[PDB]
Each structure stands twice: as structure tokens, then as C-alpha cells.
């Protein structure tokens, strides 16, 4: 099945596939981990979440604001809160 | 005679042939072990139980979900409860 | 694809899935290993080969001859030569 | 500009963005590195090359064969020769 982001595993919140406790990226099929997980294929990795809030401002695309080198995007609607992100 | 699954032997519940107390896999001929048993041949091993509950969801076939290597199935109607399984 | 039995891997001949160099049973998809392999599902394990030669005699079913406890079968047409077998 | 795959840098052939000589993945803008390069964004990474030769066989799609974890594809027409790949 599909990955559920974010998911909580051992009290740790994940907004993307993780190598936490693994040799290969995996994701939970449930927000609250109950034993269902799978290794991640390219399509399974978390995609940019638009729009997202950063510094109290709304972003509709990848941005260099707050980075100034490589554009990035949030992996949740509110980066200020979750701080989950990835380079684009 | 025929294996009875699950069977209880020395405080352990077995849903398949076991090496519990032996070198070669065996099974009890009674739900509650009372001295009747036999060594398991290929046909004696437990078969998949469908459907089965896993991660609070109903599965009608084997699944690769939750396994680091191969598709598997529960050996009881409720894997979450019994945790008994085999690869497919 | 399908397993090829027997297959040679690092000069070792295998007539069934093996854990040789692995944490889980696997098989080569080519008689002469060239990098193609897969983990084995139940259907992939080597099945009895009938008829098979043992002690210069032909066997059409699993036999206890030469064992006298649990019936077994060869995993190749000529056990005398290959010595590959499994309990039935 | 755009990545050129494969590209040669300091005696190494790269069929995808690389961390060779850096902390962040990059790629040469020329087959033979001559000073033109850029850091890779998601879109810059090499894409699967179909069909590709693997184990002397022709593959038209990604395959789980040969991988301990995930389906993959070659980054060149001949994996046996180049050994360049990526997960799918
Ligand atoms: C980390 N993992 C989810 C890939 C495997 C271990 O899972 P679990 O044994 O904590 O349920
Ligand atoms: C997400 N980021 C680290 C790339 C840039 C924003 O950084 P910060 O202002 O939240 O520290
Ligand atoms: C002896 N042993 C502890 C390894 C296994 C079987 O013990 P028991 O619980 O059946 O008495
Ligand atoms: C534990 N399980 C029944 C969910 C799956 C089998 O686990 P694994 O040992 O193949 O990774
Ligand atoms: C043993 N194995 C085939 C599962 C993996 C290692 O394969 P290889 O690296 O010798 O080609
Ligand atoms: C195959 N076997 C070991 C079960 C019985 C035959 O043994 P052997 O006569 O080849 O030694
Ligand atoms: C320095 N290093 C050996 C770790 C990696 C890069 O070396 P080089 O071959 O590019 O000169
Ligand atoms: C090496 N390969 C390209 C055949 C497959 C990937 O290997 P693995 O590291 O996922 O097991």
C-alpha cells in the first residue's frame, strides 16, 4: 500500500521514508505504526508539499529563501512547525 | 495421525511444526499435548490462513508488507494477536 | 524468472535455493551464475526429481531405503552422482 | 547547463550525479570534464536506460532480480559492462 506521511515510529515522527532502524529506506503504511511497512521505491519518497509555511510566509514553489544556494521545499504544510524538508 | 494447529506444548502455543524440544520438526496430534505426536513431512506443515488480520487490516492473500525478504501469510485468523506466520 | 537447478555459484554447485553468502534462501536464474538471482518463495524451492537413481536403483517416489526413518527424495536424476536430496 | 552522462572526471566514469570530490552531488556539463559542472537538483539525476543488458538478457523495465531490496534499472544500455544503475 501507500506510505503515510507523517507516521510515528517508536515516538519519532517521520515525514519521509527513513533508514531509522534499517539498512534501506522504508515507510509505515499507517500514521501510527502498527507493524505495516515497506521499503520505498522512487515514487514512495515524500514529495514537496505546496503550499508550505516558512518564516510565517506561504510558498507555492521550491525556494532559495533562507538557503541562498539550492532551492528546497517543505515536506509538510507548515515547515516552521515540523521542520521537515528536502532539496528540490 | 494429523497435526492439530495450534497445539500447546510445555507452556508454548505452536501454530506450525516445531523444533521445540527436538532436532527435527514435529507436531502434536492433539490441541493440548498428551503424548501423541509425529515428525513432520512436507505436507504436515501449517498452511496459510485467509483472511487474516495484520496491522488492523484484513488480508486475503500473502503480502510482502512487513517482511525484509519475502511475501508471507498468517497461520491464524489474527496475526496481530497470535504473531504466527510462514513465508509463501 | 525461474530458478535454474542446478546452478553454479563461485564454483559451488547448488540443486536448491541456498543461504550461501546470504541471510535468506536464494537461487540463480542461470545455470552458470552471471549476476541474476532472486530470493526464493515456496514455489521456488527444488522439488523431488523422479525418477532418481540411488544405489544403482531407480526410484519413482520418496523412499525410506537407505534412511529407515523419514522418506526422502533426490534433487537430481542421479543421487549417486550429485548426492543432492531433501526429506519429503 | 545540462548534465552529460556518462562523464569522465579524474579517471572515473560517472553515469549519474556524483559526490566524487565533493559533499553534494554534482555532474559535469561535458562528457570529458573541462571545468564545467553544476550541483544536481532532483531533475538532474540520470534516468533509467531501456532496454538494458543484465546477466546477458535484455530488460525493458526495472527488475527486482539481483537486488537485496528494491527494483532497479541500468543507467546505460549494458549493465554487465558498465555496472551503472539506480533504484526505481
Ligand atoms: C525498521 N523496520 C520497520 C524496517 C523493521 C523493524 O520493525 P519492527 O520490528 O520495530 O516492527
Ligand atoms: C530548510 N533549510 C534548512 C534548507 C532552510 C531554512 O533554514 P531555517 O531558516 O529554518 O534555519
Ligand atoms: C531447553 N530450552 C530452554 C533450550 C528449550 C526447551 O525448554 P522448555 O521450556 O521446553 O522446558
Ligand atoms: C514479521 N512479519 C510476519 C510481519 C514478517 C516477516 O518478517 P521478516 O523476518 O521476513 O522481515
Ligand atoms: C549471494 N547473493 C547472490 C544473494 C548476493 C551476492 O551476489 P554477488 O555479489 O556474488 O553477485
Ligand atoms: C539421502 N539420505 C542421506 C537420506 C540417505 C542415503 O544415504 P547414503 O546411502 O547415500 O549415505
Ligand atoms: C580523496 N579520495 C581518494 C578519498 C577520493 C577522490 O580522490 P581522486 O581519485 O579524485 O584524486
Ligand atoms: C547490483 N545490482 C544492480 C544488480 C542490484 C542492486 O544491488 P542491491 O545493493 O540493491 O542488493
UniProtKB/Swiss-Prot annotation, chains A, B, C, D:
S-S bonds: 3-27, 17-40, 48-73, 62-88
Superkingdom per UniProt: Eukaryota
Posttranslational modification: O-linked glycan consists of Gal-GalNAc disaccharide which is modified with a sialic acid residue (macro- and/or microheterogeneity account for differences between BSP-A1 and BSP-A2).
Expressed in which tissues: Major component of seminal plasma.
Localization per record: Secreted
Functional summary from the UniProt entry: Could enhance the fertilizing capacity of bull spermatozoa upon interaction with heparin-like glycosaminoglycans present in the female genital tract. Exhibits both simulatory and inhibitory actions on the release of pituitary gonadotropins.
Oligomer and partners: Homodimer.
Stated name of the protein: Seminal plasma protein PDC-109
Part of the intact protein present: 47 to 134 of 134
Amino acid at each position: 500500500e501507500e506510505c503515510v506521511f507523517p507516521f510515528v515510529y517508536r515516538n519519532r515522527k517521520h515525514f519521509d521514508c527513513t533508514v531509522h532502524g534499517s539498512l534501506f529506506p522504508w515507510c509505515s503504511l499507517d500514521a501510527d505504526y502498527v507493524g505495516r511497512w515497506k521499503y520505498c521505491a522512487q515514487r514512495d519518497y515524500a514529495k514537496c508539499v505546496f503550499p508550505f509555511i516558512y518564516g510565517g510566509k506561504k510558498y507555492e514553489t521550491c525556494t532559495k529563501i533562507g538557503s541562498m544556494w539550492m532551492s528546497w521545499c517543505s515536506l509538510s504544510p507548515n515547515y516552521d512547525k515540523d521542520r521537515a524538508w528536502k532539496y528540490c
